[PDB]
Ligand binder design. Structure first.
Ligand SMILES: Nc1ncnc2c1ncn2[C@@H]1O[C@H](CSCC[C@H](N)C(=O)O)[C@@H](O)[C@H]1O
Lengths: 687, 17, 6
DNA sequence: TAAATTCAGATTAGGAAT
DNA sequence: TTCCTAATCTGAATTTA
């Protein structure tokens, strides 16, 4: 039958005071109720709408009833998003330790659309659910309807939102730049956010993090081992329960050269700490009272957290198996490489601990590799766990750095907390890179119509013009600055711990005050060293400036026929063959020289000049570890440890600590309760 | 009956544009 | 107390 | 056997020419 | 609209201390 409008029309000007711009579709008048197929729909009704072929029936809430100026009978509704209607999509079928997506759990949005009454099918009972009500007072309510929603979804930044100490667990902690930045920003916002625990399977990163944070319980192990260790630390906290012992040092689950199970490190009486030995529990069965003492005092000291002891969990799971740099990735199935599954392990630990806040960080290819399968996976794991969630992309250089590192950050917050915003850029940046089209709405940036005057985009000279000269072989971990800081960025990066609100060493100046740390470049072998020596000190100089190199047709390198193959002192060619082959012979990166006025898009774990522009502008060496950490905002006092390559890996895998610092300020504002409203973006105060 | 339909400011990271 | 040296 | 050295793919965003 | 080009928290095969 024909759909009809029911009841007297709304007052002419009342409808304009309610719907002004409706008077790009214009309306003759407005109504309140409408019948289609012998069922009356009033305003505010939740409605099922016919969709395309193979498309599920849309879900909407009616906002107007009006006849269009084209004599049509229109209705308009704002849509409910299914869990698969959001950016999650195919990963709506995943489950994390029990929790699954409820098929009856939709998400209200402010996205509106006008259609005709003929698109309407049947009513649907959708109840609004408060998570902060009695937990069993939500059950019968959910089973007394058809669909339910406890959260709103926003396309902007994929926001799932509701309608003073704090502990932080740093999973895959590395050297600790991300957790350090979070703590610094939270201290600026007025929150005592510390780092109580840190897990990383690389030993030198643990060394660095514990050096810069002595009170942090840094564990040199894997994340799955740590999760099983938490599981089998809980039951000892519940039970309280050849030689002789004096005390037990530590506890662990599994590990290298060991089988699954709980092990204790033992100090034997009459023997030194060098004779302390890792032992299983079935062989420590004759040592009950000392295990009781260990468990009791470690529980009182919170050496390991129980469910509820972690307020924030931050993570930087490995991107080596997701990055576009890895030309061996498996797009067909991403959860085959173990380094990709470490994100699943991370979210499993999040499920076990249930922290108030979650902050996962990765690179942009997590939203592109396997069409973003892993990234959305993360979001799904948060949505299936009833977490408020948010997804953003933040450029490092926009927060005071001479580098363009766009990173994806996943915020998560329990419904009892306030979902934290993303900090707007405080700096302009040299745009070097492209954001995905499917996540254009997740770029943390000012819109084009309004952008205040931001501080000038930092260049490389602003970061390294301060540092004194060093040679290819610089074996000194600690040295002195050749002079005073030149630029504002260098003055900020040379600030002490207390000037940067770093309370790791309490009051009083900590170690290495005013010293130049890790100002050591990668020591190239003699061949690469003299290859670098042959590169001219000019802007744009690279291997194409070496002897015997020519640029042929279509910017393709060739050999010079008139010049014989230039040979080094060792009997190996001056110009390597891979330099001639790279990027179908069209690359300027091999043995590239960077200059003071041109930025570095992304500092990486490897510092060889071979396939990147990493040679110092005026010195015959690659950029030092301290210079790369400066490009990523590490304060000069943050000392690294390990071999030179390992320190490079540490600063290249880290998070730019200005980025983490802005995130920490936003997190502190959300944690304390100081928030404006629905805006996912936040303008930072002077800092 | 028939099917219904279900339907973005640019950002600026640089100094200009 | 008492334990093993492995 | 480990350590060092050498070479290298698959997509996608934007950018100038016309 | 064309092609390119720039860009991707790097990995694996081979050779050599
Ligand atoms: N299976 C695993 N278990 C535990 N840690 C792992 C791991 N695989 C990789 N890692 C660690 O994950 C770390 C990621 S680097 C993250 C650095 C940190 N976000 C910062 O800002 O400093 C690496 O240091 C690596 O050692």
């Amino acid at each position: 039958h024909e759909p009809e409008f029911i009841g007297s029309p709304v007052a002419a000007d009342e409808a304009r005071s309610n719907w002004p711009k409706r008077y790009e579709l214009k309306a003759r008048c407005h109504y309140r109720s409408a019948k289609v197929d012998n069922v009356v729909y009033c305003l505010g009704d939740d409605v099922y709408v016919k969709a395309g072929e193979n498309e599920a029936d849309y879900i909407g809430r009616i906002t107007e009833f009006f006849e269009g100026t084209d004599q049509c009978h229109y209705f308009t509704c704002r849509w409910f998003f299914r869990a698969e209607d959001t950016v999650i999509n195919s990963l709506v079928s995943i489950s994390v330790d029990g929790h699954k997506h409820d098929p009856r759990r939709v998400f209200l949005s402010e996205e509106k659309n006008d259609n005709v009454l003929d698109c309407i099918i049947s009513k649907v009972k959708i109840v609004h659910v408060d998570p902060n009500m009695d937990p069993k007072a939500k059950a019968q309510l959910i089973e007394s309807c058809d669909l339910y929603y406890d959260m709103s979804y926003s396309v902007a930044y994929s926001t799932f939102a509701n309608i003073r100490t704090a502990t932080l667990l740093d999973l895959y902690s590395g050297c600790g730049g991300m957790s350090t930045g979070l703590c610094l920003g939270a201290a600026l916002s007025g929150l005592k956010l510390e780092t109580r625990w840190a897990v990383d399977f690389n030993s030198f990163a643990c060394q660095s993090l514990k050096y810069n944070h002595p009170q942090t319980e840094v564990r040199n192990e894997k994340a799955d081992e740590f999760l099983a260790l938490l599981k089998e630390w809980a039951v000892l906290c519940k039970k309280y329960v050849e030689f002789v012992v004096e005390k037990l040092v530590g506890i662990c689950y599994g590990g290298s050269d060991r089988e699954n199970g709980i092990y204790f490190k033992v100090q034997w009486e009459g023997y030194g700490p060098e004779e302390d030995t890792w032992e299983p529990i079935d062989n420590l069965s004759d040592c009950p009272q000392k295990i009781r003492e260990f468990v009791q005092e470690g529980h009182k000291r919170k050496i390991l957290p129980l469910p509820g002891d972690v307020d924030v969990i931050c993570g930087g799971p490995p991107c080596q198996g997701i990055s576009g740099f890895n030309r061996y990735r498996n797009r067909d199935e991403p959860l085959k490489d173990e380094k990709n599954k470490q994100m699943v392990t991370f979210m499993d630990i999040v499920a076990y601990l249930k922290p108030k806040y979650v902050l996962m960080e990765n690179v942009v290819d997590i939203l592109k590799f396997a069409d973003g399968y892993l990234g959305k996976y993360a979001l799904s794991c948060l949505v299936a766990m009833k977490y408020q969630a948010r997804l953003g992309m933040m450029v490092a250089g926009c927060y005071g750095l001479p580098q363009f590192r766009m990173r994806v950050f996943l915020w998560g917050a329990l419904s009892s907390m306030v979902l934290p915003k993303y900090p707007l850029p405080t700096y302009d940046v040299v745009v070097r890179g492209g954001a995905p089209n499917a996540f254009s709405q997740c770029m943390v940036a000012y819109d084009e119509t309004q952008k205040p005057s931001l501080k000038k985009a930092l260049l490389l000279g602003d970061a390294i013009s301060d540092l004194p000269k060093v040679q290819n072989h610089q074996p000194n971990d600690v040295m002195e600055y050749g002079g005073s800081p030149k630029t504002e960025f260098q003055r900020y990066i040379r600030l002490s711990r207390k000037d940067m609100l770093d309370w790791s060493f309490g009051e009083g100046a900590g170690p290495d005050e005013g010293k130049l740390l890790d100002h050591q470049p990668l020591r190239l072998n003699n061949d690469d060293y003299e290859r670098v020596q042959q590169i001219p000190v000019k802007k744009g100089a690279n291997f194409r400036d070496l002897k015997g190199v020519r640029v042929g047709a279509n910017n393709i390198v060739e050999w010079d026929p008139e010049i014989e193959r230039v040979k080094l002192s060792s009997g190996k060619p001056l110009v390597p063959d891979y330099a001639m082959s790279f990027i179908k012979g069209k690359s300027l990166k091999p043995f590239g020289r960077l200059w003071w006025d041109e930025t570095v898009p992304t500092v990486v774990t490897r510092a060889e000049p071979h396939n990147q522009v990493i040679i110092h502008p005026t010195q015959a060496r690659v950029l030092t570890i301290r210079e790369n950490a400066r490009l990523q905002g590490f304060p000069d006092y943050y000392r690294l440890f390990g071999p030179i390559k390992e320190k490079y890996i540490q600063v290249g895998n880290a998070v730019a600590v200005p980025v983490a610092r802005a995130l920490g300020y936003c997190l502190g504002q959300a944690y304390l309760g100081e928030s404006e409203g629905s805006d996912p973006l936040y303008q930072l105060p002077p800092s | 009956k028939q099917t219904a339909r279900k339907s973005a400011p640019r950002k600026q990271l640089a100094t200009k544009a | 107390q008492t334990a093993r040296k492995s």
